[PDB]
């Protein structure tokens, strides 16, 4: 029912442009006006640009006007945001979003698409380095031992640890990530009790988006 799909994301070195586009499926596009909303990390959800129902008002925010651009396209049903002069301060998740049509000069966003993320940086694509989190044999608390893989140094996101299906206890806890120096690092641990392990080999499976697989335990 009512769908907004994003599609422009990327990792852009500061300075450039980009065009985010958006796809409306779900209703008579032309009857609503659209908006763009961005969720930048730690800082907030910021509203970035608005185009009127069909064309009357393209309507900008102080922080992007002059770089940002709101292009509609009714017949073809896609909303665009072309960007230029992109600053680091723009790295973010961009949401295409519908208008409202409910009441009184109110501007609300009745529908939101997936997010379509955008990192503006310079730093360059590094593969993650998997490492074992091994204890020795048994060693946790009881007769269950926790293990880990430290994946250390990558840039950009997602890097993934996949571990083992086969719960008879198998809790993987992945600590979420943090930047250090420009690279991300994170860990996923899982706990197998006693018999299992060192009896038959556990493994981490690490994938990073910019196409590498590491494998270990």
């Amino acid at each position: 029912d009512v769908q907004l799909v994003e599609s422009g994301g990327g990792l852009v070195q500061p300075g450039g442009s980009r065009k985010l586009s958006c796809a409306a499926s779900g209703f008579t596009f032309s009857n609503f006006g659209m908006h763009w909303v961005r969720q930048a990390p730690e800082k907030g959800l910021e509203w970035v640009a608005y185009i009127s129902s069909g064309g009357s008002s393209i309507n900008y925010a102080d922080t992007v006007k002059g770089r940002f651009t709101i292009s509609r396209d009714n017949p073809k049903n896609t909303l665009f945001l072309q960007m230029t002069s992109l600053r680091s301060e723009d790295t973010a998740i961009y949401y295409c979003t519908r208008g409202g049509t409910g009441t009184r000069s109110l501007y609300y966003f009745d529908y939101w698409g997936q997010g379509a993320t955008l990192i503006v940086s310079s730093a360059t694509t590094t593969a993650p380095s998997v490492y074992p989190l091994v204890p020795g044999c048994s060693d946790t608390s009881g007769s269950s031992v926790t293990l880990g893989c430290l994946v250390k140094g990558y840039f950009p996101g997602p890097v993934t640890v996949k571990w083992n299906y086969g719960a008879l206890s198998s809790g993987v806890r992945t600590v979420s990530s943090v930047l250090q120096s420009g690279f991300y690092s994170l860990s996923s641990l899982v706990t197998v009790p006693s018999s299992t392990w060192p009896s038959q080999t556990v493994i981490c499976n690490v994938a990073h988006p910019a196409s590498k697989t590491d494998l270990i335990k």
């Binding site: 907030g44 959800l45 910021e46 509203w47 309507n59 925010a61 102080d62 998740i93 949401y95 979003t97 409202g100 409910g102 009441t103 009184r104 000069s105 109110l106 501007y107 609300y108 966003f109 009745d110 529908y111 939101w112 997936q114 997010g115 490492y131 074992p132 989190l133 091994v134 204890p135 060693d139 946790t140 608390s141 926790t146 880990g148 430290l150 250390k152 806890r173 992945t174 600590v175 979420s176 990530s177 943090v178 250090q180 690092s185 994170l186 860990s187 641990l189």
Partner: protein, 206 residues
């Protein structure tokens, strides 16, 4: 820009309860306030508009109020499937703007960290490094404090930390402190101690 302020960003809220969540305007909005609900993944959902309109199908235990500059969202019987964090925005004056969001979380009876310390693999150390991990698992509350000593002092310089987010199954979180060390001052040393406080005790847990 009216600044929008949601004061109180975390709320252990239990289940079957009303959450009031509050929002307040720098200028007086004209009761133009609206509430969006964002959950775990992406998800912004709209929830109520014009201080009070529930959008279609938002199921009616959600309710809001507000008049002047000051506003709040109310949930009547908090259900496990409403646990998402919540934002309030102004659809009255350019730039339209946003409450920064209240994450909301599940209370549970306390508990304590199953610690583990972990030394450099061989891999690592080959490369120059020495990262030591200490992972205090399953617990509630979020708050677990953690320390690192080398050979009889605190290591401040060096640590880094992150928590799991809250676990589905039982609401308990996990967390990993890690001193990243080079292999040379790993070689400067002998005991490494991760040691932790935590509402559930009184002995550090080491």
């Amino acid at each position: 820009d009216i600044q929008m302020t949601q004061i109180t960003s975390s709320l252990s809220v239990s289940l079957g309860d009303r959450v009031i969540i509050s929002c307040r305007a720098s200028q007086d909005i004209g009761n133009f306030l609206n509430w969006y609900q964002q959950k775990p993944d992406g998800s912004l959902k709209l929830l109520i508009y014009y201080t009070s309109r529930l959008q279609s199908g938002v199921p009616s235990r959600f309710s809001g109020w507000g008049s002047g500059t000051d506003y709040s969202l109310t949930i009547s019987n908090l259900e496990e499937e409403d646990i998402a964090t919540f934002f309030c925005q102004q659809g009255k004056t350019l730039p339209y703007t946003f409450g920064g969001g209240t994450k909301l979380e599940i209370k549970r009876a306390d508990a304590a960290p199953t610690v583990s310390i972990f030394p450099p693999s061989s891999e690592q150390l080959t490369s120059g490094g020495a990262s030591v991990v200490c992972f205090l698992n399953n617990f509630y509350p979020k708050d677990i404090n953690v320390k690192w000593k080398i050979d009889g002092s605190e290591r401040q310089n060096g640590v880094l930390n992150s928590w799991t987010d809250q676990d589905s199954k039982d609401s308990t979180y996990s967390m990993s402190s890690t001193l990243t060390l080079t292999k040379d001052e790993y070689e400067r040393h002998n005991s490494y101690t991760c040691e932790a406080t935590h509402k559930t005790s009184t002995s550090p847990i080491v």
